[PDB]
Copies of this chain bind each other. A is one copy, B any other.
Amino acid sequence: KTIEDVFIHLLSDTYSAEKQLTRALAKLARATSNEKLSQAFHAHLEETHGQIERIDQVVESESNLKIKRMKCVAMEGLIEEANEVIESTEKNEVRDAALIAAAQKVEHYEIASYGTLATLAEQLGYRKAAKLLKETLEEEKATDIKLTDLAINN
């Protein structure tokens, strides 16, 4: 019933979301015909594991924190949009354009989640965590910009 409870709840949700995204990204990388988009998805795959480890670092920076086991239902839905694109397109540029739009939805959600986690961390006085969450936030922004640019020369 405290702000720290809300933060742990949200961090736990994002932890689930990231874990789910590792599976989705491995699959997206194999589903596209475009080598640059595929490489983009694979790079974000590796970075995502780096981001989960960062959440682990957030939890260790404040002895009271913990990751509660849960399933982030919102991410399931966003990952499904990409699945549906795959099932309704041939492996070509129509699929690529639609997968990038679906991936942007995923980025929208993740950027908003980390912005919220960062603000909470700072309002809680969690200095190291704030910094770590901002680091991931910046990586997601770069990732999103990259999808946009890929879309343009796509």
Contact = CB atoms under 8 A, between A and B. Distances in A.
A6 B73 contact: no
Contacts of A108: 71, 73
Contact of A105 (B76, B115, B122): B76
A81 interface: yes
Query: So how many copies of this chain end up in the complex?
Result: 2
Contact of A116 (B10, B76, B80): B10
Interface in A68-124: 71, 73-74, 76-78, 80-81, 84, 105, 108-109, 112, 115-116, 119-120, 122-123
Interface of A: 1-3, 5-6, 9-10, 13, 71, 73-74, 76-78, 80-81, 84, 105, 108-109, 112, 115-116, 119-120, 122-123
